Structure formats: C-alpha cells, structure tokens
C-alpha cells in the first residue's frame, strides 16, 4: 500500500482476510487452503516477477483447485464418449451407476 500506516502501527486494520486461507470465522476452511498456502509460502521474499515463472506449479494447481476446469473436460470427455459409445451400444451400465446398489 501507498502511505502504509498499517505496518507502521503493526495492527491488522484489514490485511488479514485478503485471501481465502485467512482466519475463517470459527475454524472452517476455504476449499483451497492446501494450495494457496503452498502458493504463497513459495512466493515470499522472492517477490513479484520471480513469483511468476518458477512458482508456476503452485498457481497452475491453485488455478485448478479454484476454477476446477480440467476436471470438467476430463469429466465431459467421459460423457461425450459414453453418450457416443452407448447409442450404438457396446456398454452396459452397472447397477451402481443406474440406481440400485448397496449403500453404506
């Protein structure tokens, strides 16, 4: 910040909930704690332009814990195949994917 009168006083006016993994209300978690943590403990003291090329594994993962996109095409390519495979057959769905199973 410009005119950073928060570090100068030390107090956390509002810099303690900027991101997801940040002191949830009682004890909850924000669905990507494991990844944002691994992203931001990586990008500390290396700041900025070198948090953008070497700490790319942690963002490429956190960009998929959060958006969760590649799991869709990996779960839409399934349907596209099965919907194509069946309808011309060659596939008999089991009991536990068309209903009847033994729940636990």
């Amino acid at each position: 910040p410009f005119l950073d009168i928060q570090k100068k006083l030390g107090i956390s006016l509002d810099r303690h909930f900027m991101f997801l993994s940040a002191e949830q209300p009682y004890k909850n978690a924000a669905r990507c704690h494991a990844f944002e943590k691994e992203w931001i403990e990586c990008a500390h003291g290396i700041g900025g332009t070198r948090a953008k090329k070497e700490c790319k594994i942690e963002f490429d993962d956190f960009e998929e814990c959060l958006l969760r996109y590649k799991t869709m095409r990996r779960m839409h390519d399934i349907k596209k195949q099965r919907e194509k495979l069946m309808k011309e057959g060659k596939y008999t769905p089991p009991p536990h994917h068309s209903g009847r199973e033994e729940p636990r």
Partner: protein, 344 residues
Amino acid sequence: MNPITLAIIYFTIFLGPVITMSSTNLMLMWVGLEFSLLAIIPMLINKKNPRSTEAATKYFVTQATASMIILLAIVLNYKQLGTWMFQQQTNGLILNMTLMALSMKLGLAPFHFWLPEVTQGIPLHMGLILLTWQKIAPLSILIQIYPLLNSTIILMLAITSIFMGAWGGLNQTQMRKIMAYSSIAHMGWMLAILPYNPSLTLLNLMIYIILTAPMFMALMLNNSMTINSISLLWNKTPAMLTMISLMLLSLGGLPPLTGFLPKWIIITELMKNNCLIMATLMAMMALLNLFFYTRLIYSTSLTMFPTNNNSKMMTHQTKTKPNLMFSTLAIMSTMTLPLAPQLI
C-alpha cells in the same frame, strides 16, 4: 451549512484517499472512492441553483458508473485467483476495464467531457478539491498496479488527454474551464509514465497541486471567472501579477521554472525506455498549452484592459489574502528548479 455538517463532510473527504491509501483490499480501496463521492455533492450544491445541480448530477451519474466498472474488476478478480488484490497474473480486460474506469474518475481521453462542465458551474473553493484532492485516491489505485498495465492503452489515453486538454483550452474564456483542461493535459504526463518509474507521476501531482492551488485561490480573491475580469486586476491587487506571470509560464512548462521539471525528466524516462516517437507528440502540444497562458497573461498583466470607475471603491476597502498558502505555494514553485535532484 452548520459546522456539525461541515466537519463531517470535510472528514469523509479526508477518509476517501486515506482509506484508499491505508488499505490493501480492493474493497476498502473502493469505498474510499465513494466517501470522496458522497461528501463532494453537498458542497457542489451550496447555492442550489441550476448550475450546481446540473454539475452534481453530471458529477454523480458520470462517476458512480465508474465505481461499478471498478468493482466489476475486483469481483472478476475475486473469482480468478481468489483474493482482493490485482496480484500479478490477472487477465487484461479486467484491468483495461479498471484503467478504463479510473480514466472516468479522473477524466482523460473522451472521459473529459464532464470535468469542465462540472468544474464550471461551481464555486472556486470546491474547484480546488476536484483537480487536486479527488485526484489522489484514483491514482492510489493506480500506483499499486505499478507493473501489469497495458502499455498500449495507458498511452493513447495520455496523448488523447494532451490534445483534448489543449485544443479545448484555447476557446475557453472562463478560467474554470481552462484549469479543467490543464488538469487533463498534465494527466497525460502523470498517466503515460505510470509503468515507467511512477515516482515521477507522484511528482507531477505534487507539482500540479502547487500550481493550481495558488491560481484557484488567486481567483477566490476577486471571484473572476472570465478573462475580462482577471484583466481588471492591476486596479484591485496589482501586487499579484508578479506570480501569475510565473504561475502560468511554469504551469505551462518553461525551463527556469519548476513546471518544466516534470515535463522534462518524464521525457527522459520516456526516451530511456525506447519510445522516442511518443514523447515528441506530447511536447509539441504542451506548447499549445502556453498559447492560452501567453494570451492570458497578456490580458491579465502585460496590457491593462480598460477598467471601471465603480472599481475605484475597491481601492479603499483593504482585502485580506491568505498566509503561508500562496507565498509559499508560488515560491515553493516557480523558484525550485535548481532543487530538482531533491525532487527526484
């Protein structure tokens, strides 16, 4: 106005930047633009005439849409890489629509058509707050995004603010519509050098604030919003002509005066970053930003326009000019060129 209302509105103005400054979240940093948006309107409208209302509506509707177009880019960024900051790898049109909106808060390329209309139809006090203090918090959005601005559109908004703030300032007799288009010209210098060492745009702001504030306060002294009214000043307070000749020939940057410093060392940062062909288009048009100051100091100083005899009473009644606010801000500018290394 009632002091219990004044202090509250002189204080929300003191919160807008200061919360846009002392806050990393782009939500605290958003509301700061609004405290500076609520508070201004009650004092735009102190006379409640058909000139104050039309400005406030033209100041509000023009500038709440911008607060939304900002706030979109946060939420579009609150989804992508979930947090409340433009981190490094945010998408472009999130920010090129952010910078879009700031340019409406400030008024640059075609987003300038509201500034003079609002800076016209307004008192001189509260002409000084827009062009100097409302301008600090939007830039505080915009220094924090130090890298990671599109170098292409950040720069067409500059040149378009050099042209449109210079071509337009020629026609305009009313000083308030001149100083509006001075703000727009000087912002192409604040705003073109934003990726390129923006310790120079924090400069051009603290210079520009030292130039206008004497001027708007030099017009409070007689409430002259016309060339023909600032002219008849050799009969009222001739002692002021010595500064305005320099306040304007500096605010249009000529070298021995400090207002050439920002226009100059900026170009160094432009030349030094291999944009040899852009800075010229600016500096060739910053000369046109002298023609309606050359012409203006003629009408003011270097040719006594024909005054009134009713003005003979004004040579009896002993005005009072401020202290520490004009003599400082007119010598702390126009005579500080040799201290440029201390500036930068």
